[PDB]
């Protein structure tokens, strides 16, 4: 699975369905420009055991929450929305799943 198609209300908050299978850890990124060779921008940061959206001056209010991960329902302006799914016993064994949105 390389992409996940999900449905939500355009421009309103949406808890993203995590496509990572059992025994995989999830981390959310934007892949800049949807270009494989480009940087991955991490969307959430852990502080004192809780996760919060990184306040990028540019990204705006795209990330509504990291408890749970919640976006405004739209494609990111800066690139693709990607979750990295990492196997619980081998962090070098992972697969990235791009999330794309249909609108209701
Ligand atoms: Ca990617
Ligand atoms: Ca073993």
Residue numbers in the entry: 18 to 121
Authors' account:
ORF8 is a viral immunoglobulin-like (Ig-like) domain protein encoded by the severe acute respiratory syndrome coronavirus 2 (SARS-CoV-2) RNA genome. It tends to evolve rapidly and interfere with immune responses. The full-length SARS-CoV-2 ORF8 is composed of a signal peptide (residues 1-15) and an Ig-like domain (residues 16-121). Herein, we determined the crystal structures of SARS-CoV-2 ORF8 (S84) (one of the epidemic isoforms) and the bat coronavirus RaTG13 ORF8 variant at 1.62 Å and 1.76 Å resolution, respectively.
The Ig-like domain of SARS-CoV-2 ORF8 (S84) forms a “β-sandwich” that comprises two β-sheets and an additional β-hairpin. The smaller sheet is composed of three antiparallel strands (βB, βD, and βE), while the larger sheet is formed by five twisted strands (βA, βC, βC’, βF, βG) with loops. The protruding β-hairpin exists between strands βC’ and βD, consisting of strands βI1 and βI2. Of note, intramolecular disulfide bonds, including Cys25-Cys90, Cys37-Cys102, and Cys61-Cys83, contributed to stabilizing the β-sheet structure into an irregular β-sandwich fold. The electron density of residue Cys20 suggests that a potential intermolecular disulfide bond exists between two adjacent symmetric units. In detail, the SARS-CoV-2 ORF8 (S84) dimer is linked by an intermolecular disulfide bond formed between the two Cys20 residues of molecule A and A’. The residues from 62 to 77 in SARS-CoV-2 ORF8 (S84) assemble more tightly than their equivalent in RaTG13 ORF8, featuring a maximum 21.4 Å shift. In ORF8(S84), however, the closest distance between the two 71 - 75 loops is 2.7 Å, which occurs at the side chain of the two Asp75 and may not help SARS-CoV-2 ORF8 (S84) to form a dimer with this interface. By contrast, C20A and C20K mutants could not form a stable dimer in the absence of the reducing reagent. Thus, these data suggest that the SARS-CoV-2 ORF8(S84) form an inter-chain disulfide bond at Cys20. The mild disease outcome related S84 variant of the ORF8 protein demonstrates weaker binding ability with CD14+ monocytes, indicating that the ORF8 variants may adjust different degrees of inflammation by modulating monocyte recognition of viral antigens.
